[PDB]
Each structure stands twice: as C-alpha cells, then as structure tokens.
Design a protein around this nucleic acid. Structure first.
Ligand SMILES: [Zn+2]
Lengths: 60, 154, 50, 62, 51, 120, 102
RNA sequence: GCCCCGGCGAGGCGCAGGCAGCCGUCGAACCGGGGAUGCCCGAAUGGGACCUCCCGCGGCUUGCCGCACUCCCAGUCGGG
RNA sequence: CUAGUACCGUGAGGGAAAGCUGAAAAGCACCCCGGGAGGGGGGUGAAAAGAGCCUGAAACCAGGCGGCGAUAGGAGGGUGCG
C-alpha cells in the first residue's frame, strides 16, 4: 500500500478503498477492548496517504 | 540474601554462632531497650517462657531508664514496672527465626544462649495533627531495629 | 437533575482522566527514575478552579 | 463573629469564572469583564509596567 | 539577581527576628544578603577597571 | 563534520545530542594491514555482517561477526563476547568500535563500494 | 617541520624542546572544566626579519615561538616575569635592531 | 504524523535502560528545501454569550460561497 | 530535574523542593523460616558500590570495652603529684 500503487488508480477506487479501510479500523478498535498491535497505526497512515494523493489529483 | 544492614557485634564465628534481625518495626525503641536488657545473657527457651509470661501479664518488666509517672508493682525488688506486649511478640518472632537458623546451621537448641541483644532507632515516619488556633504539630511514628546473636555452650 | 454547562462538564471530564498514577512499564523502562507526576489530586484535599 | 462562622456563607454564586480569552478564573460574572486580561472591557490586553505576571509567564527579567 | 522576591517584615513582638519574609506557605526569608537565596553583599562588577 | 570549538561543554553536548546521520561516522573502526594494502583505506564505519577482532579488554584476541549496532548507546554486539548470568543465560558484553579491528568486510551494497572509491 | 627538527638537532636546542614536551602536565583545580587544561611549558624563541615559511615549519614544535623584530614584546622575552629565554636570532633581525634599537 | 526534490548510506519506532510487534535496498530513520491537512475560543467579523458553547438569512448545487464596524474608489455591479 | 511547575489567595497577585550504582545489569539462580515488609544461608563483581545505590563528616541513639561509682558542695577548669 504505497504511492507507487495508489497513483496508478482512479478516484472512485480510492474513495471505495478509504471507505473499506475506515470500516476495518472501527471493527479493529472495537475488538481491541476485549496480536499485531500495529494494524490501527498502519490503517491510519494508509488513509492519510490515500487522501493526500486524491487531493493532489483533484487539485491538478 | 538481599540484606542491607550490618550488626553492632564484633568477632562473629560462623561455626558456633547464629544471627537474626528485625528491621523497620512499628514499635517503641524505649520499651525494646528495657525488655532486651532482661533477656541478655539467658537461654533461648527460658527467654521464650519469660516472654510468654510477659504477654499473659504475669511477670512485669522493670523500668530503670524510662520511668516517668510509672507506678510500682507487687514483689521484692520492684519500683517501676510495665507489660510491653507488642514488643514481646515481635521479639518472640525474631527469637524463633534465630532458633531456626541455628538448627539449620547444625547447632543444638538445648544449649543455645543469647550473647547479644540490642535495639536501634530506625527512620521516622512524619505526620501532623491539627491543633487549636490554626496550628499543626508533628504526629510521628518512631521505628525500631533489633539484632540478636546466639551461641552454643560447650 | 443537577444542572451543568457543557464546556464545564468537558473540563471536569479531563480533570478526572488526568488523575491516575504512572503505569508500571514506564517504571520498568526508566529503571525506577519516573515514579510520580505532579497532577495527582484527591477530591477532598486540593480543589479545582471549577 | 467576623471569623470562622462567616466563612460558611461561601456557597453562593462565584465572583469569578473562567475566561475564554485568558484561560484563567478571573472573569467577573456580574460586571462582564476579566480582571487579568480585560476581556469584555477592551479589545487590547491588560498590561501594566508595575506588574510581574506577564513577565513571569514569559520567563523575563523585571 | 537576588532581588526578585516580594517580602514583608513582621516586626517587634513575635518571638522572632525582624527579617523580611515571604508571605506564602513556607514563609522563608528573602532578599537580604545573609539569607539563603538572597542578594550578595558586594558582588563582582563589570564597571570595575582592570586595564 | 565541522568541529572547531575548544570548549568541552560544547564538544560533549554535540556528542550526546548528535543527529543519527553522523553517529555511524562517529562509530568507525580501522582495517587490518592486509585490507589496508589491498583497498587503500585506513578506516570505515562499521556494519553488522562484518568480521571483527578485539584488541583491548578482557576479550582480547577474540574474533567474531557483528550481530547488532546501537547508535544511541554508541555500542556493538559481537558473537562470542558474552558473560553468563546468575541463572545461566548468556548475554552479550557491549563494546566500543574504537577498541576493535575489521578483518573481513561485508560488501553487498554499492554505497560502501562508493565510500571506498571516494576515500581512496 | 622535519627539516626544522634536523636544524635544531644540529644547533643544540632539541634538548630544550624535549624538556618543554616532558614538563607539560594536567593542572590541579577547576580550570579543567573551563578548558584551560594542559599547562604547557616554554621552549625557544626564533626572532626573524621576514616570514617566508619558517612560521609554518616551526609552529608545531612544543614550546617554540616565532616572531618578527617589528612586533616584539616583553612576554616573548620574559614569560612569567622571569627573563633569560633561549633565543635564536638572524642576521637581518640584528641589523634591524641596529636600526631601531628597541 | 502525509507528499515531492536533494544529501548520507543501514538501520529505525521522542524525554524513556519494557512487552508485543511493524517500517526500511522500490534507499528509510536523520539533515537542507518546497507542498498538503490544520477542531473551538481569541482583533474575532452573519447574530448572541452566567461558563471555549449556541441561534440564523440569502444563492447554488445534502454539501459549498456570501452576509460585522469605521472609511477610500465607485454605484445600486464590484474593487481596496 | 515532567519550573514560572506543584501549592496559596474571591481577585489584583504570591511562589518551592528535588543532580551522581557499576567497565558491563553481570539488578542476586537455589535452599530454610516467616501471614507478609522481610530475615538467614548461598552466589555476581577488582570492589556491595544492592537501586532506601560515589565518598559518607558532626550533632544524636544503642551495645561492648576501660576508669570511677549510694557520708556527700561548686561556672565543671588550673598547678603539683599518686
Ligand atoms: Zn482574561
């Protein structure tokens, strides 16, 4: 999940991926109350990447 | 293991002697002094009997250094006397510890004899009690250390 | 029942979250150099500024 | 008299509350101004030369 | 340096000496040259001529 | 790096708070005469997969590979430089690279080849 | 520096240079915190008419000072208030002394 | 903490000596430079503040732009 | 040094204390006692320096050792002897 791949795609796919990632994050934070404690961090930063690059595109 | 204190006793022979200590105890050092002055130089079992009796309030302990406002007791040789129960109990615990240590070193309990018994003042725990006219004065606990050395009579 | 302004409620919630002791792994990781912080507070000794 | 007993009548509404601009509990609730920053009385900050408060807050020499 | 504290002296009639003291919880003496944390009586000065 | 200050407070401040891209340089070690003659270089910054010989201390004369490098503490770990614990587990003794010599390099990245090309 | 070394060996001041090296110590006191460690001893003084390389050549010998005649002071000639320093003169320097006398 | 251009060249995840795990040879961490995001109050400015929170009017298409006071140029559009 | 911090005052304002194990955590395996803080054996280390950690003074407390000690009068010392 890197800009190399992200910048190869279109905008609709990016928004869809953001959506599914946010749902994943909510579910993982739900279970965290009750392995691999870095899933949340990596999800957050993937979301940030996607938004940054989508904005680069929609600005140019 | 993990002890952080030494003893006031010199010339300790690990072959004929055993040691025991009690550290940071919430008891009176004055009463500790008075009590140990009596068991100094005695046999361990006689001393345990003495302490049992003190606890049951049948034998009083004489007061020769700390005796302000202290009443006399019945019996020959008694001015001021008292019954220190907490101190008796703690000293009994330490004495049983020492008996164990000798038994495991390989001495014989029937001939064990107390040759050193000394109380020391430990660190003070500060406190405060409110008084009248807007004051606050100290209300502190004074702690005690106790050391004991037993020898085997041959 | 008991009436509060909302911003005040939020400030109180923060003051409550603040009041707990240093965790154990911090003490382990610092080798017993961090044991306390300056925002411990008991509701009956030191008052907030409301 | 004048001492311990009148201290019991400090359950009324407070004279000062928290200020939105300054941050601290110096906003006079009945007059509508702050006694530390001047909010509600002036656009500009309260700042006197005889005061040490702002110098302390900035770790400055007197 | 040494002249940052605000003080108030108590005066005659407190079983105490007439020294200037802080007016909050600890109430330690301040600002005088025989007080701990006070000003120094005759410090070094840069006006002094060395040439 | 530029270090022209004769005040020890400033020297030691720099050393204690130096940024990471200079600690590798600060953690350099010398080469053996053979490698020196061959490549034309006197010293290099140290790396993990290097073969190493100890020249100062209790483990004087021991050879081993490097297995760990800590830039914060300015130390390295060497295989075979160990002491036992009260229970019996072995644990590494941490060494300074100024006390050790390199006898076989790990040459798989091109940037070390470039460092040698540069300072030779 | 090596040529200066050889010349000083042939003249007979290398032993004073060695004394300067040997009699250099780490101080006593708190000057070590403020730099100022390594109290260094004094060696010979070379007085010259013009600098054409001797400054560089002789600088790094411990205790050795190089100075021209036009820029002489009493701290080169009497360090510590104690006079009688070992000095190497040149012919041009002595002629310039004949001219200025001071 | 997100992106890009350069430097350095293998480790990195603040003060902070831990556990479990992730990032990095597609060149990271770090350093110089340039961008993005940037909640509420606050000159605080669409209107109100005894609690850093509330209540709106137009236009477009649920999301966006405009809407304070004292003035200049204009003029019922606007630009400062 | 988690300092204009903790804390004091309705407010204007006032304002502390607190540095150091060791070359390396090698930060004490295992045993007996104790309800437990812990004590005693054993170990690591060149040195316990044991985290209540560099050195570790005085006042003060306890014990041991030496001298005196229940018919006796001076600010606690000075001279001469035993
Ligand atoms: Zn204000």
């Amino acid at each position: 999940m890197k800009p190399s791949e992200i910048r190869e795609m279109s905008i609709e796919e990016i928004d869809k991926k953001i959506r599914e990632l946010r749902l994943e994050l909510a579910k993982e934070r739900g279970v965290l109350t009750m392995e691999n404690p870095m899933v949340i961090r990596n999800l957050r930063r993937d979301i940030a990447r996607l938004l940054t690059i989508k904005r680069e595109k929609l600005r140019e | 293991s993990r002890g952080r204190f030494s003893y006031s006793f010199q010339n300790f022979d690990p072959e004929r002697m055993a040691r025991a200590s009690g550290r940071d105890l919430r008891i009176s050092p004055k009463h500790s002094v008075e009590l140990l002055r009596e068991i100094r130089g005695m046999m361990l079992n006689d001393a345990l009997r003495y302490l049992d009796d003190v606890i049951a309030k049948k034998r009083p302990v004489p007061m020769k250094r700390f005796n302000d406002s202290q009443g006399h007791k019945p019996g020959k040789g008694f001015g001021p006397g008292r019954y220190p129960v907490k101190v008796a109990k703690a000293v009994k615990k330490i004495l049983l510890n020492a008996k164990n240590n000798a038994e495991q070193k390989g001495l014989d309990v029937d001939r064990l004899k107390i040759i050193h018994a000394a109380a020391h003042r430990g660190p003070v725990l500060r406190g405060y009690i409110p008084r009248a006219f807007g004051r606050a004065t100290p209300f502190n606990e004074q702690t005690t250390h106790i050391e004991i050395v037993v020898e085997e009579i041959r | 029942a008991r009436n509060k302004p909302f911003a005040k409620k939020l400030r109180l919630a923060k003051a409550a979250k603040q009041n707990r002791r240093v965790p154990v792994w911090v003490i382990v990781k610092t080798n017993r150099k961090v044991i306390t912080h300056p925002k411990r507070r008991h509701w009956r000794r030191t008052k907030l500024k409301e | 008299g004048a001492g311990t007993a009148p201290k019991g009548k400090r359950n009324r509404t407070p004279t000062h509350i928290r200020c939105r601009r300054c941050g601290r509990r110096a906003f006079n609730v009945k007059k509508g101004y702050c006694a530390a920053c001047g909010f509600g009385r002036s656009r500009r900050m309260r700042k006197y030369s005889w005061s040490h408060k702002w110098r302390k807050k900035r770790n400055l020499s007197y | 340096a040494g002249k940052r504290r605000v003080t108030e002296n108590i005066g005659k009639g407190h079983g105490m000496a007439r020294v200037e003291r802080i007016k909050t919880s600890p109430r330690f003496a301040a600002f005088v040259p025989f007080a701990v944390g006070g000003r120094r009586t005759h410090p070094p000065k840069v006006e002094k001529i060395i040439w | 790096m530029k270090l022209d200050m004769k005040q020890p407070r400033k020297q030691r401040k720099f050393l204690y708070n130096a940024p990471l891209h200079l600690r590798g340089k600060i953690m350099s070690a010398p080469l053996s005469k053979e490698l020196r003659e061959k490549y034309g270089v006197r010293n290099l910054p140290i790396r993990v997969g290097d073969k190493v010989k100890v020249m100062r201390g209790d483990f004087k004369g021991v050879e081993g590979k490097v297995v760990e490098v800590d830039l914060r503490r300015y130390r390295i770990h060497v295989e075979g430089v160990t002491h036992k614990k009260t229970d019996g587990t072995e644990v590494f003794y941490p060494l300074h690279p100024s006390n050790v010599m390199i006898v076989e390099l790990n040459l798989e990245d091109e940037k070390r080849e470039k460092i040698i090309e540069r300072r030779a | 520096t090596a040529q200066t070394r050889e010349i000083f060996k042939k003249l007979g001041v290398w032993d004073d240079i060695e004394r300067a090296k040997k009699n250099t110590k780490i101080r006593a006191g708190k000057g070590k915190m403020r730099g100022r460690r390594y109290k260094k001893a004094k060696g010979p003084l070379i007085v010259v008419a013009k600098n054409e390389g001797i400054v560089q050549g002789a600088r790094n010998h411990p205790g050795v000072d190089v100075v021209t005649v036009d820029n002489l002071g009493v701290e080169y000639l009497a360090p510590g208030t104690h006079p009688g320093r070992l000095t190497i003169w040149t012919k041009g320097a002595i002629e310039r002394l004949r001219e200025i006398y001071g």
